[PDB]
Amino acid sequence: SCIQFTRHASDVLLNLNRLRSRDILTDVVIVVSREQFRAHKTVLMACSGLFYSIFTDQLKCNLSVINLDPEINPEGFCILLDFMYTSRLNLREGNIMAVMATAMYLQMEHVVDTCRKFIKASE
Amino acid sequence: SCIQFTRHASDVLLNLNRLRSRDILTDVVIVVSREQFRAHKTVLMACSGLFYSIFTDQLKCNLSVINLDPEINPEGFCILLDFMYTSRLNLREGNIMAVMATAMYLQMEHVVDTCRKFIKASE
């Protein structure tokens, strides 16, 4: 018998992104070569199969710093982190290969899917 | 130049609710008289002006237990916590006054608004 507020999920996500912008309650630093990204573990887990596996591990759930594979592109990671917090993916000709490789590593299936479709359209 | 995944915000919220159901990364217990509710501080802050004020406070942000006012109804709080994590509000004739009073206390303006409209329709 529930009623539903249509905009609630997007309002929550917008407020989580505002917390991230203000560095409020951020609890992990993701390191991607020379770059560092502060984030909330729960948002990362909710968006990525890799982070879900990492933060449900009984030892890794306690870490405040996670180092990604050195082959991961920081700009690709930055674009995906923004997508996690906003539903918007800044996909461009100059970044699509790095975004797709990063989404494959992070296990973000819907992003891998749109990248594959955009690449197929150019060939 | 971004593209947007329509279902992303609702998928994130669904995954945050799955973490709550499995007690994964929950970092606060909200006590409402004799009842206890485990939750994620960031989701509570994103949904409630009261929790935003509490967890942005330099002392209270560190607390693992928050006690609400003894006048707050636990069922009303439970209904609102479910709404935070799902966008669905289980509003019924038998709970509407408690839900509205709890939403006023938690500073959840859209919920207070729908409660006021449902009460006005019955008079």
Binding site: C2, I3, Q4, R7 | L89, H110, T114
Partner: peptide
């Protein structure tokens, strides 16, 4: 907003 889901 509010709707019947």
């Amino acid at each position: 907003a509010w709707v019947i889901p």
